[PDB]
């Protein structure tokens, strides 16, 4: 039942879009909670944190259907069935970000006259290269 | 002014990718946990904290640059605006997005997936109502 093949369906696309939205909702609500914290609204901060746990549960349930339905990781288009595949998906996305995505973002920010944003993107490119290397060391261990 | 720039769009896409990376790594950590790889689980959780810091810094530049929430295209400068953003996205999800995903899943022969989407529609309605009660408290002082 939950093992039915979802490949080629609109439902497959909808699970991907739901995962994206849920992922953003958790991040948004935790960020909003920091503002409630500063301003002295602990009940609102607590509600934001509790609802954020709900959006974790939603995002993880979307990933369960993606994996059980034979779909790929929404971020990388790589299989994530096994732990080894999960680490290979982590490596693929980190490698895209440090080789291509953040360096390109930093070049654009400098060109448009945002050097402070460009320095941030350059920091992140170096950070994602470190992440890729740490994950590569783990994959070598598992294999 | 970041408004209308390519850099605005790059901060939005960076926020999306970072948001997904933290969720992905915490999900992967659960499989490491089950299988008895606590060093791998620990690394995934520590790197996930990295990706929180990346996402939040992207939101810092977005807010400071007068750009809108990546998810809702609503301003997020003040706490009231943040709660209004929360309400807008929850409302979209329960009134349109998850009902529509549930109908497509039923029509394509995936009743279990459709039931999950219907559960989530009802959940996001409850979220919207709780955030609406917060907004009333803030707006009414
Ligand atoms: Cl409060
Ligand atoms: Cl381990
Ligand atoms: Co089943
Ligand atoms: Co949700
Ligand atoms: Co990373
Ligand atoms: Co990152
Ligand atoms: Co919600």
SS (H, E, C) chain B: CCCCCHHHHHHHHHHHHHHHHHHHHHHHHHHHHHHCCHHHHHHHHHHHHHHHHHHHHHHHHHHHCCCCCCCCCCCCCCHHHHHHHHHHHHHHHHHHHHHHHHHHHHHCCCHHHHHHHHHHHHHHHHHHHHHHHHHHHHHHC
C-alpha distances out from residue A103 to A119, A129, B53, Å: 10, 11, 18
The first and second tokens of residue A12, run together, are: 């497959």
> Is B124 marked within a binding site?
yes
- Is A29 close to B86, i.e. CB distance below 8 A? yes
The first and second tokens of residue A118, run together, are: 């460009």
B112, containing H or E segment? helix B111-140
Q: At what angle do helices B38-64 and A83-96 cross, to 10 degrees?
A: 30
Provide CB contacts within 8 A for A15, sequence distance 6+.
A6, A62, A65, A66, A69, A71, A74, B113
The first and second tokens of residue B74, run together, are: 């609503």
Answer yes or no: are the C-beta atoms of B24 and A73 closer than 8 Å: yes
Q: Residue A124 and residue B50: Cα distance in Å, rounded?
A: 10
**Total domains in the fold of chain B:** 1
Answer yes or no: are the C-beta atoms of B94 and B121 closer than 8 Å: yes
Residue A19 in contact with partner chain B when CB distance is under 8 A: yes
| Structure determination technique employed | X-ray
Q: Which of A63, A93, A102 sits opposite B27 (nearest CB)?
A: A63
Q: Which of B59, B79, B110 sits opposite A36 (nearest CB)?
A: B79
B128: number of CA atoms within 13 Å, CB side? 15
> Is B35 marked within a binding site?
no
Resolution of the determined structure in angstroms stands at 1.3
Q: Residue A73 and residue B37: Cα distance in Å, rounded?
A: 21
Instruction: Show residues of chain A in contact with B19, CB under 8 Å.
Output: 20, 23-24, 26-27
> Is B18 marked within a binding site?
yes
Structural domain boundaries, residue B23: 1-141
A75: closest CA of chain B, how far (Å): 7
Q: Residue A103 and residue A90: Cα distance in Å, rounded?
A: 19
- Is B93 close to A21, i.e. CB distance below 8 A? yes
């Amino acid at each position: 039942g939950h093992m039915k093949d979802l490949k080629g369906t609109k439902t497959a696309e909808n699970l991907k879009q739901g995962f994206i939205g849920e992922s953003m909702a958790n991040r948004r609500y935790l960020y909003f909670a920091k503002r409630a914290d500063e301003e002295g609204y602990p009940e609102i901060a607590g509600l934001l944190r509790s609802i954020a746990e709900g959006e974790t549960a939603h995002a993880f349930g979307h990933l369960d259907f993606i994996r059980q339905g034979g779909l790929t990781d929404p971020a990388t288009d790589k299989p994530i069935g096994t732990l080894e595949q999960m680490i290979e998906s982590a490596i693929a996305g980190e490698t895209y970000e440090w080789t291509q995505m953040y360096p390109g973002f930093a070049k654009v920010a400098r060109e448009e006259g945002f050097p402070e944003v460009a320095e941030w993107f350059e920091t992140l490119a170096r950070a994602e290269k470190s992440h890729a290397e740490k994950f590569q060391n783990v994959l070598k261990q598992l294999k």
